[PDB]
Protein backbone atom coordinates (compact mmCIF):
# COMPACT_ATOMS: atom_id res chain seq x y z
CA UNK A 1 0.00 0.00 0.00
CA UNK A 2 0.68 3.70 -0.34
CA UNK A 3 0.91 6.25 2.44
CA UNK A 4 1.67 9.89 3.27
CA UNK A 5 4.86 8.89 5.17
CA UNK A 6 8.36 10.01 4.20
CA UNK A 7 11.63 8.23 3.51
CA UNK A 8 15.02 8.50 1.80
CA UNK A 9 15.12 5.16 -0.03
CA UNK A 10 12.42 2.79 -1.16
CA UNK A 11 11.66 -0.69 -2.46
CA UNK A 12 8.44 -2.74 -2.95
CA UNK A 13 8.68 -4.61 0.29
CA UNK A 14 8.75 -1.25 2.02
CA UNK A 15 10.11 2.20 2.42
CA UNK A 16 13.54 2.03 3.94
CA UNK A 17 15.55 3.63 6.69
CA UNK A 18 18.58 5.16 4.96
CA UNK A 19 20.64 5.31 8.18
CA UNK A 20 22.54 2.06 7.89
CA UNK A 21 24.80 0.78 5.09
CA UNK A 22 23.29 -2.56 4.09
CA UNK A 23 20.22 -4.67 3.56
CA UNK A 24 19.73 -8.32 2.77
CA UNK A 25 16.18 -7.48 2.00
CA UNK A 26 15.61 -6.79 -1.66
CA UNK A 27 17.95 -5.64 -4.49
CA UNK A 28 15.62 -3.22 -6.23
CA UNK A 29 15.93 0.23 -4.69
CA UNK A 30 15.49 3.88 -5.52
CA UNK A 31 17.00 6.79 -3.62
CA UNK A 32 19.82 7.36 -1.15
CA UNK A 33 20.01 3.74 -0.25
CA UNK A 34 21.71 0.84 1.48
CA UNK A 35 23.24 -1.99 -0.53
CA UNK A 36 22.02 -5.52 -0.97
CA UNK A 37 23.56 -8.82 -0.04
CA UNK A 38 22.59 -12.44 0.10
CA UNK A 39 23.07 -12.91 3.82
CA UNK A 40 21.16 -13.40 7.05
CA UNK A 41 22.72 -10.93 9.43
CA UNK A 42 25.76 -8.75 10.08
CA UNK A 43 26.55 -7.55 13.57
CA UNK A 44 29.73 -5.86 14.74
CA UNK A 45 30.78 -6.19 18.34
CA UNK A 46 30.86 -2.98 20.25
CA UNK A 47 31.25 -4.69 23.62
CA UNK A 48 32.88 -8.06 24.37
CA UNK A 49 32.23 -11.46 25.98
CA UNK A 50 29.70 -12.21 28.75
CA UNK A 51 30.51 -14.82 31.41
CA UNK A 52 29.14 -14.82 34.95
CA UNK A 53 30.01 -17.68 37.30
Amino acid sequence: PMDECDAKCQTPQGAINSSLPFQNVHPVTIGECPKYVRSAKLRMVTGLRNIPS
Binding site: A15, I16, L42, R43, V45, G47, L48, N50
Partner: protein
Protein backbone atom coordinates in the same frame (compact mmCIF):
# COMPACT_ATOMS: atom_id res chain seq x y z
CA UNK B 1 44.56 -8.35 54.45
CA UNK B 2 44.03 -5.97 51.54
CA UNK B 3 43.90 -6.79 47.85
CA UNK B 4 43.75 -5.00 44.52
CA UNK B 5 42.23 -6.59 41.45
CA UNK B 6 41.47 -5.86 37.83
CA UNK B 7 37.89 -5.59 36.65
CA UNK B 8 35.74 -5.36 33.56
CA UNK B 9 32.15 -5.46 32.40
CA UNK B 10 29.75 -8.31 31.91
CA UNK B 11 25.97 -8.18 31.89
CA UNK B 12 22.82 -10.25 31.43
CA UNK B 13 23.10 -9.96 27.66
CA UNK B 14 23.04 -12.84 25.18
CA UNK B 15 23.26 -11.14 21.75
CA UNK B 16 25.69 -12.88 19.43
CA UNK B 17 27.85 -12.93 16.29
CA UNK B 18 29.48 -15.49 14.08
CA UNK B 19 33.26 -15.21 14.20
CA UNK B 20 36.41 -16.74 12.58
CA UNK B 21 37.27 -18.78 15.64
CA UNK B 22 33.88 -19.40 17.28
CA UNK B 23 30.18 -19.26 16.38
CA UNK B 24 27.09 -17.77 18.08
CA UNK B 25 29.65 -15.95 20.18
CA UNK B 26 28.07 -14.06 23.04
CA UNK B 27 28.93 -10.53 24.11
CA UNK B 28 27.66 -7.72 26.28
CA UNK B 29 27.11 -4.96 23.74
CA UNK B 30 26.74 -5.25 19.99
CA UNK B 31 25.58 -3.27 17.01
CA UNK B 32 23.63 -4.58 14.04
CA UNK B 33 25.06 -3.11 10.89
CA UNK B 34 22.10 -4.34 8.95
CA UNK B 35 18.69 -2.94 8.15
CA UNK B 36 16.86 -6.25 7.82
CA UNK B 37 13.47 -4.54 8.07
CA UNK B 38 10.98 -2.91 5.76
CA UNK B 39 8.06 -0.81 6.88
CA UNK B 40 5.62 -2.43 4.44
CA UNK B 41 4.74 0.95 2.96
CA UNK B 42 5.16 3.14 -0.06
CA UNK B 43 6.28 6.37 1.54
CA UNK B 44 7.63 9.23 -0.57
CA UNK B 45 11.06 10.78 -0.87
CA UNK B 46 11.94 13.95 0.96
CA UNK B 47 8.44 15.50 0.84
CA UNK B 48 8.29 14.86 -2.95
CA UNK B 49 5.48 12.45 -3.76
CA UNK B 50 5.93 9.61 -6.28
CA UNK B 51 3.97 9.01 -9.43
CA UNK B 52 1.21 6.45 -9.04
CA UNK B 53 -0.28 4.64 -12.02
CA UNK B 54 -2.69 2.64 -9.90
CA UNK B 55 -3.79 0.04 -12.41
CA UNK B 56 -2.39 1.66 -15.51
CA UNK B 57 0.34 0.78 -17.92
CA UNK B 58 3.04 3.22 -18.87
CA UNK B 59 1.32 3.24 -22.24
CA UNK B 60 -1.97 4.08 -20.54
CA UNK B 61 -0.22 6.84 -18.62
CA UNK B 62 1.68 8.48 -21.43
CA UNK B 63 -0.90 8.31 -24.17
CA UNK B 64 -3.97 9.61 -22.37
CA UNK B 65 -6.18 6.63 -21.60
CA UNK B 66 -9.17 8.33 -19.88
CA UNK B 67 -9.25 5.79 -17.06
CA UNK B 68 -5.61 6.74 -16.54
CA UNK B 69 -5.90 10.10 -14.82
CA UNK B 70 -3.65 12.40 -16.81
CA UNK B 71 -2.38 14.32 -13.79
CA UNK B 72 -0.72 17.22 -15.62
CA UNK B 73 -0.11 18.83 -12.22
CA UNK B 74 2.37 16.01 -11.58
CA UNK B 75 5.40 17.87 -12.91
CA UNK B 76 8.30 15.92 -11.42
CA UNK B 77 8.35 13.34 -8.67
CA UNK B 78 10.37 10.99 -6.53
CA UNK B 79 9.87 7.73 -8.39
CA UNK B 80 7.49 5.72 -10.54
CA UNK B 81 5.21 3.08 -9.10
CA UNK B 82 3.58 0.25 -11.01
CA UNK B 83 2.16 -3.10 -10.21
CA UNK B 84 3.84 -6.12 -11.84
CA UNK B 85 0.78 -7.12 -13.88
CA UNK B 86 -0.62 -3.79 -15.06
CA UNK B 87 -4.25 -3.89 -16.13
CA UNK B 88 -4.68 -1.13 -18.65
CA UNK B 89 -2.56 -1.66 -21.66
CA UNK B 90 -3.72 -0.02 -24.85
CA UNK B 91 -7.40 -0.07 -25.72
CA UNK B 92 -6.48 -0.54 -29.42
CA UNK B 93 -3.44 -2.87 -29.52
CA UNK B 94 -0.35 -2.47 -31.60
CA UNK B 95 3.33 -3.09 -31.33
CA UNK B 96 4.98 -0.52 -29.07
CA UNK B 97 8.61 -0.60 -29.97
CA UNK B 98 11.51 0.32 -27.71
CA UNK B 99 9.46 0.00 -24.52
CA UNK B 100 12.78 -0.54 -22.72
CA UNK B 101 14.39 2.58 -24.04
CA UNK B 102 11.46 4.82 -23.28
CA UNK B 103 11.31 3.45 -19.76
CA UNK B 104 14.97 4.10 -19.15
CA UNK B 105 14.55 7.59 -20.55
CA UNK B 106 11.64 8.05 -18.19
CA UNK B 107 13.58 6.58 -15.30
CA UNK B 108 14.07 10.10 -14.03
Amino acid sequence: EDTICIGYHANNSTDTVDTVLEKNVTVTHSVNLLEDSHNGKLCLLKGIAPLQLGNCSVAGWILGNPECELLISRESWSYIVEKPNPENGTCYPGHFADYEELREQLSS
